[PDB]
């Protein structure tokens, strides 16, 4: 019902990420640039994940699909069934 959710990654949330980043000062143009890179990254992982879901004739995406996806993408996550 809200077809453009990329926005829900709110400026403050991105600021905080950037803080953990160790960033002191943030150009305004960033947020959108970030939102975009986020979108790509999620898009890429979730594609591979759903591939894995679909390959197992499941209608439900599992935590393991997301790990198999993150491992392929070279982006390996510990603590969900690794």
């Amino acid at each position: 019902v809200l077809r453009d959710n990329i926005q829900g990654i709110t400026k403050p949330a991105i600021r905080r990420l950037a803080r953990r980043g160790g960033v002191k000062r943030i150009s305004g143009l960033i947020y959108e640039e970030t939102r975009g890179v986020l979108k790509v990254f999620l898009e890429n992982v979730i594609r591979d994940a759903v591939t894995y879901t679909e390959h197992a004739k499941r209608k439900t995406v599992t935590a393991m699909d997301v790990v198999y996806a993150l491992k392929r993408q070279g982006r390996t996550l510990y603590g969900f069934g690794g």
Binding site: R20, G22, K24, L70, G74, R75, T76, L77, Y78, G79, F80
Partner: protein
């Protein structure tokens, strides 16, 4: 009898379970008998090393249970372990405190 092989290797890690994972994982046709030993040995040793450093992480922090963050602080602060876990995200692990000098105020 009923002696376990871990028991003969003097390992907590299951020399049993490992030998079976090797065969059923499609790594090779035949698995040596020394192999699921030498492996468990190394998987145990590395398990120790991480829990050794992380267990000290949890002292410093005045905590009794190890949380991920102790693992993060353990791994990232050791040069070798960090090379090894180079491409490894550690859920709920966060980042080592670091602030670049040029960003600090001069006073």
């Amino acid at each position: 009898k009923a002696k376990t092989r871990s028991s003969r290797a003097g390992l907590q890690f299951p020399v049993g379970r490992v030998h079976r994972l090797l065969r059923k994982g499609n790594y090779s046709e035949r698995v040596g008998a020394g192999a699921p030993v030498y492996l468990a040995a190394v998987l145990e040793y590395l398990t120790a090393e991480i829990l050794e450093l992380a267990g000290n992480a949890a002292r410093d922090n005045k905590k009794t249970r190890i949380i991920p963050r102790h693992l993060q602080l353990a791994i990232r602060n050791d040069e070798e372990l960090n090379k090894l876990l180079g491409r490894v995200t550690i859920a709920q692990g966060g980042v080592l405190p670091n602030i670049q000098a040029v960003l600090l105020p001069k006073k």
